[PDB]
Structure 1
Amino acid sequence: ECCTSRELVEFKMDRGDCEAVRAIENYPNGCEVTICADGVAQLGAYCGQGPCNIFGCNCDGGCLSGDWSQEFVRRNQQYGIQIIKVTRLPFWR
């Protein structure tokens, strides 16, 4: 399968700042981040556990796993993540 799915998440924080959760400032609309299924900011070209093929598929270890924006909130409990918007990419099909 392909590790091309990701989410664009806009949120506010009760504690900490956007950088603490590897997000970027989007003042005056909070923070924005692009995550993989593990609820962590995307760190490669795709959301594989490791490298992917030319299409973003057949990645080493398959795709990062988890419950998406819900996991982003969960793992960042200490910051109090207030979700505003979530967009699933690829959006169109």
Structure 2
Amino acid sequence: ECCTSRELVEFKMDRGDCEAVRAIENYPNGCEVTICADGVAQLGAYCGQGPCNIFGCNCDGGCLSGDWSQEFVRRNQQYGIQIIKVTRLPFWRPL
């Protein structure tokens, strides 16, 4: 299994600041984060449940699972996440 997909999410917060959800600041009052499908900021390079190889494949446990940016919103509902852009990467699969 390969787990190279991720989402770059640009958002604002009705309460709190970007670091509270493991995000960076993106210009005054904006935040940005890269997430796996579980709606949590990436811990690494790839979105395996456990380690992948350098290609992002042969991922132990397969991929992290979830509802992508919608799960990021739900997990962090106490901050009131206002998504302004979502970009799913890569844009296509090799071949």
TM-score w.r.t. structure 2 length? 0.92
Rounded Cα–Cα distance in structure 1 between residues aligned with 2:63 and 2:83 = 24
- The C-alpha deviation readout for 1:46-92, integer Å capped at 9, x for no partner, is 00111101311121111100010000000001000000000000024
Q: CA deviation at 1:29?
A: 5.7
Describe the SS at the equivalent of 1:72.
helix
Gaps of 5+ in 2: none
Q: CA deviation at 1:25?
A: 0.3
Q: What is the CA-CA distance between 1:28 and the residue it aligns to?
A: 2.8
User: How many residue pairs were aligned?
Assistant: 93
Runs of 4+ with >4 A deviation: none
Alignment partner, residue 41 of structure 1: 41
CA RMSD of aligned residues (A): 1.2
Instruction: Write the distance in 2 (CA, Å) between the matches of 1:29 and 1:18.
Output: 9
Q: Counterpart of 2:19 in 1: which secondary structure?
A: helix
TM-score computed with the length of structure 1 as normaliser: 0.94
The share of aligned pairs that are identical, in percent, is 100
1:45 CA displacement:
1.5
